[PDB]
Amino acid sequence: ASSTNLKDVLAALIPKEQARIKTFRQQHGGTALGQITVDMSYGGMRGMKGLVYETSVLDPDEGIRFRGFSIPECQKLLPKGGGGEPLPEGLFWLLVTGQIPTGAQVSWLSKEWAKRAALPSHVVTMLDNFPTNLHPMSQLSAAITALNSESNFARAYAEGILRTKYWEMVYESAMDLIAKLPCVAAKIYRNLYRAGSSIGAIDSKLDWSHNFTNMLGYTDAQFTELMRLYLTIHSDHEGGNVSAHTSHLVGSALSDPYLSFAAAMNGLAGPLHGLANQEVLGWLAQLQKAAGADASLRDYIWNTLNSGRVVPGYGHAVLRKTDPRYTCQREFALKHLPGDPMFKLVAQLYKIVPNVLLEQGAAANPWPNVDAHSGVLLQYYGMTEMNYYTVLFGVSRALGVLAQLIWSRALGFPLERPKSMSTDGLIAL
Amino acid sequence: ASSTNLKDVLAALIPKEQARIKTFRQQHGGTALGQITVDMSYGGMRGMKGLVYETSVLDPDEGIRFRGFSIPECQKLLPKGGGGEPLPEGLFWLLVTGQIPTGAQVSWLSKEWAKRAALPSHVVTMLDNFPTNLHPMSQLSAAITALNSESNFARAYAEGILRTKYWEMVYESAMDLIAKLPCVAAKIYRNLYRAGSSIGAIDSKLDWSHNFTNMLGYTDAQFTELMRLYLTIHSDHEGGNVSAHTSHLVGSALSDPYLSFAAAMNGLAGPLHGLANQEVLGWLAQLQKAAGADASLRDYIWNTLNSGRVVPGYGHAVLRKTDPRYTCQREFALKHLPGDPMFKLVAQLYKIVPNVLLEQGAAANPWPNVDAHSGVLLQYYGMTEMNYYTVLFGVSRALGVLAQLIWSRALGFPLERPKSMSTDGLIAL
Numbered sequence: 001a002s003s004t005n006l007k008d009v010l011a012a013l014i015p016k017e018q019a020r021i022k023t024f025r026q027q028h029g030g031t032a033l034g035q036i037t038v039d040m041s042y043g044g045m046r047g048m049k050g051l052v053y054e055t056s057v058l059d060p061d062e063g064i065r066f067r068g069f070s071i072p073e074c075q076k077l078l079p080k081g082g083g084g085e086p087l088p089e090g091l092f093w094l095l096v097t098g099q100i101p102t103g104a105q106v107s108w109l110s111k112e113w114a115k116r117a118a119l120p121s122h123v124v125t126m127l128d129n130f131p132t133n134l135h136p137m138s139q140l141s142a143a144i145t146a147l148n149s150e151s152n153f154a155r156a157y158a159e160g161i162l163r164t165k166y167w168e169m170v171y172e173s174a175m176d177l178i179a180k181l182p183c184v185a186a187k188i189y190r191n192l193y194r195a196g197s198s199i200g201a202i203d204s205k206l207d208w209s210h211n212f213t214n215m216l217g218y219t220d221a222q223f224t225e226l227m228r229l230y231l232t233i234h235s236d237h238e239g240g241n242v243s244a245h246t247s248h249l250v251g252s253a254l255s256d257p258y259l260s261f262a263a264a265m266n267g268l269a270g271p272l273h274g275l276a277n278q279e280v281l282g283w284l285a286q287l288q289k290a291a292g293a294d295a296s297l298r299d300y301i302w303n304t305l306n307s308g309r310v311v312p313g314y315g316h317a318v319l320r321k322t323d324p325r326y327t328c329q330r331e332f333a334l335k336h337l338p339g340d341p342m343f344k345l346v347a348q349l350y351k352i353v354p355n356v357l358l359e360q361g362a363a364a365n366p367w368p369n370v371d372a373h374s375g376v377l378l379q380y381y382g383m384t385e386m387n388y389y390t391v392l393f394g395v396s397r398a399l400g401v402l403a404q405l406i407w408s409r410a411l412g413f414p415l416e417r418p419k420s421m422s423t424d425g426l427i428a429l
Numbered sequence: 430a431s432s433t434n435l436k437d438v439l440a441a442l443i444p445k446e447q448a449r450i451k452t453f454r455q456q457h458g459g460t461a462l463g464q465i466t467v468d469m470s471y472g473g474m475r476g477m478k479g480l481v482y483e484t485s486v487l488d489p490d491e492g493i494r495f496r497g498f499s500i501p502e503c504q505k506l507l508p509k510g511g512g513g514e515p516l517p518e519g520l521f522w523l524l525v526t527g528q529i530p531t532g533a534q535v536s537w538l539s540k541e542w543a544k545r546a547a548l549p550s551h552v553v554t555m556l557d558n559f560p561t562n563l564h565p566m567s568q569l570s571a572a573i574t575a576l577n578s579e580s581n582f583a584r585a586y587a588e589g590i591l592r593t594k595y596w597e598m599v600y601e602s603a604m605d606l607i608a609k610l611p612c613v614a615a616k617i618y619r620n621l622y623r624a625g626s627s628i629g630a631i632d633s634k635l636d637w638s639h640n641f642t643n644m645l646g647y648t649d650a651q652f653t654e655l656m657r658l659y660l661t662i663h664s665d666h667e668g669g670n671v672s673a674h675t676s677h678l679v680g681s682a683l684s685d686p687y688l689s690f691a692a693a694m695n696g697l698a699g700p701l702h703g704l705a706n707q708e709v710l711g712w713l714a715q716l717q718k719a720a721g722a723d724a725s726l727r728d729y730i731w732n733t734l735n736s737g738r739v740v741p742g743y744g745h746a747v748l749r750k751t752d753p754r755y756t757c758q759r760e761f762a763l764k765h766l767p768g769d770p771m772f773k774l775v776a777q778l779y780k781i782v783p784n785v786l787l788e789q790g791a792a793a794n795p796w797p798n799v800d801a802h803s804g805v806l807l808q809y810y811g812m813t814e815m816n817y818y819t820v821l822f823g824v825s826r827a828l829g830v831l832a833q834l835i836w837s838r839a840l841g842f843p844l845e846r847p848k849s850m851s852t853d854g855l856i857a858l
């Protein structure tokens with residue numbers, strides 16, 4: 001009998017996986033997977049296999065995979081709006097279950113995130129009172145922190161539930177949080193950039209992305225398509241990235257899903273991390289202030305480098321080739337905004353940057369990453385408020401960090417608490 | 430010529446250390462320090478030498494050291510109020526410089542944190558508007574996030590400063606943040622537990638701890654002494670603990686010191702982490718509701734265990750013996766509140782718990798940790814609001830996480846971005 005329910009599927013899923021991880025461990029737990037070097041320790045774990053994260057795997061050459069699903073593969077397999085871009089709802093199912101969803105499942109998440117989208121009074125209040133010089137990421141993070149009041153996992157814990165049921169309450173709070181996100185994010189956008197106006201109502205008949213754009217107040221049918229792709233591609237990037245790892249580290253201590261997410265966001269707000277979104281546009285913005293020749297394009301790049309600054313949008317800790325997330329974006333401008341002068345610049349930089357970075361001989365990866373291409377796309381659509389970009393990243397990333405978080409707790413992952421050493425202590429070792 | 434200035438000392442300190450770390454690396458960077466096992470990956474990095482953290486080192490047997498300074502050693506070497514407990518100001522100097530401060534230096538930090546203690550209007554406003562069912566840690570974290578508006582490092586970055594000067598702005602923001610902390614924390618305390626009253630003014634002639642207690646509204650001369658010790662002992666606990674590591678991870682991305690600290694706090698708010706502060710008291714509180722015999726004390730313990738719950742205040746990821754931080758606390762009750770019935774219970778549990786935990790055969794470390802002893806002490810003094818304890822932990826921990834943070838940036842530590850794997854991926858390895 002009956003219909004669609006993710007929680008029920010997971011219930012079926014958990015015990016098998018649990019069983020699966022036990023025997024593997026019983027046999028291989030002692031297996032050395034790697035070594036740790038001094039350089040590794042001073043180098044921010046660069047190269048260190050430190051975590052188990054199941055939702056996605058980053059390949060140094062090919063890049064990110066969702067099951068073992070590449071972006072191009074997701075693009076063709078994931079249910080769409082009616083209607084060329086993959087629905088983030090579907091990416092979510094996929095990340096959660098390892099399986100490709102049916103349009104039917106896809107519709108369930110949509111309704112689900114629609115029914116659940118509700119902002120408590122104390123949150124609206126705070127956001128309403130936030131100064132305008134308060135960065136959108138800051139506002140975003142305080143808000144999510146402030147929502148913790150509402151944690152089903154926090155309450156259940158306080159009640160004394162057995163550890164075995166953790167995942168259950170994590171799941172509820174993950175679904176609620178995902179659902180509330182576009183409301184919080186839009187409210188900040190409305191406050192800061194459209195003072196006096198209102199977010200409106202969520203309509204149970206639309207997909208999440210669509211209700212989001214409606215809340216942001218964008219009408220362009222192509223903008224909606226942008227959104228769906230954007231929120232899908234930004235989902236998840238394995239576990240080692242600052243935002244995902246922070247949520248993983250914080251969640252490990254038993255802090256509810258709200259608290260872990262907001263810390264994840266303080267992470268994404270960093271310039272070398274998500275903020276590159278924004279830094280890229282302000283660097284272009286500045287570029288243009290100072291139709292240029294490659295030679296002047298190259299002088300500009302050197303001065304950045306020479307000034308002990310980074311060239312935003314290039315480089316990666318794990319990727320060693322152009323980010324397929326970059327290509328994905330380029331192919332979208334190519335279809336939709338090929339004559340855009342910002343676009344062209346971005347295309348022009350592609351030709352120069354890497355070569356200049358190779359020339360400098362410092363960057364291990366001279367290729368662009370996802371952040372080099374995102375904003376260009378947004379600006380075209382009339383969303384030119386650059387200090388807001390990372391919020392968009394923010395909302396998407398939730399899909400991936402909450403998908404895994406529920407697994408961690410399902411699998412009983414323990415407290416993340418490695419050993420640290422001092423230089424003296426290492427000198428002595 | 431001239432007088433005391435920490436920043437100047439550091440300026441002298443950085444280049445030597447920098448030079449010191451380079452040659453070491455030039456010679457030993459390739460040196461394997463350890464291996465990584467499958468169990469390690471599923472086990473939250475348990476046993477993994479993953480980070481360089483210079484301010485403190487946790488020994489599995491002896492416990493925490495500040496230089497190479499033990500708590501008992503700090504207790505005798507650190508300048509005091511007039512006047513038995515070590516001043517957290519001095520611990521700070523010590524953590525920052527590796528050297529024991531003079532009373533004269535100690536006085537400088539005090540004035541310094543006094544001159545700098547100032548809360549912007551948008552912060553007071555938010556805290557004032559926070560609901561009372563909003564946990565104090567949540568309020569604490571949102572507030573610190575909200576202060577980021579004020580980041581000297583954030584502004585300097587946005588201006589395009591060379592990487593080499595990072596530490597300079599980090600230092601300023603660390604000093605400002607440390608200074609503002611007791612104001613934020615007290616304001617929450619005043620709001621929630623003393624509605625209508627006010628935090629008052631900071632007096633440049635007192636030590637930080639003293640102005641703190643004044644802001645909390647405690648008069649007891651022994652309470653002040655409590656505070657100083659409390660804030661000193663909670664300072665730092667090497668780099669691998671959830672709060673310290675989170676600040677380290679987030680700071681690595683270039684998020685300012687405000688944002689990194691607040692994420693650190695979402696970490697400390699976890700039940701297996703700082704929240705144990707609170708969980709302990711509510712477990713005792715419940716214990717007493719249900720002068721008991723060891724046998725009933727032991728039935729009580731088993732029911733906790735049997736219910737898939739933890740016994741708060743016992744156990745540690747790295748320590749394998751009683752936490753000297755626990756002993757420190759016990760010796761304080763012994764001097765000051767030896768007949769307190771809560772105290773006695775806590776003494777009684779010491780005799781039972783571990784034995785029961787040994788009986789169960791699960792905990793690697795059956796001994797109590799710092800959190801098992803803290804609240805008992807607070808409650809005696811009339812600070813019986815248990816949901817506030819972790820805030821106290823909060824304020825102290827800043828001393829250690831900001832001390833190192835300035836070093837990280839001084840030493841140019843890179844982005845913390847390890848490799849993650851999936852189970853499939855490991856199964857395949």
Ligand SMILES: CC(C)(COP(=O)(O)OP(=O)(O)OC[C@H]1O[C@@H](n2cnc3c(N)ncnc32)[C@H](O)[C@@H]1OP(=O)(O)O)[C@@H](O)C(=O)NCCC(=O)NCCSCC[C@@](O)(CC(=O)O)C(=O)O
Pocket residue numbers: 046058236237240241242243271272273274276305309310311312313314315316317318362363364365369370371841843844846
């Ligand atoms: C990304 C980045 C931090 C990688 O750091 P890394 O692994 O330590 O880099 P590296 O090439 O090994 O570093 C060697 C040297 O090259 C320098 N270098 C690297 N990239 C750059 C750059 N774009 N400009 C100038 N110099 C650079 C490094 O700063 C370093 O300098 P020093 O030895 O004096 O510090 C670095 O390339 C950079 O700072 N880029 C500029 C900022 C930027 O574009 N940030 C984008 C990050 S993408 C965010 C998301 C992610 O893809 C992240 C992930 O998976 O981790 C995800 O979805 O979550």
Ligand SMILES: CC(C)(COP(=O)(O)OP(=O)(O)OC[C@H]1O[C@@H](n2cnc3c(N)ncnc32)[C@H](O)[C@@H]1OP(=O)(O)O)[C@@H](O)C(=O)NCCC(=O)NCCSCC[C@@](O)(CC(=O)O)C(=O)O
Pocket residue numbers: 412414415417475487665666669670671672700701702703705734738739740741742743744745746747791792793794798799800
């Ligand atoms: C502290 C703690 C998480 C260590 O976790 P761990 O290293 O994974 O522990 P372990 O002994 O290796 O775990 C083996 C098994 O024993 C169980 N066990 C350990 N402690 C307890 C306990 N108190 N009660 C019941 N069972 C326990 C573990 O849960 C685990 O169970 P499963 O295999 O079914 O999960 C664990 O002992 C615990 O949950 N304790 C109860 C909560 C508590 O007292 N928290 C206090 C943490 S101190 C905070 C601060 C710190 O000292 C932290 C630091 O340095 O990291 C600092 O200053 O920052």
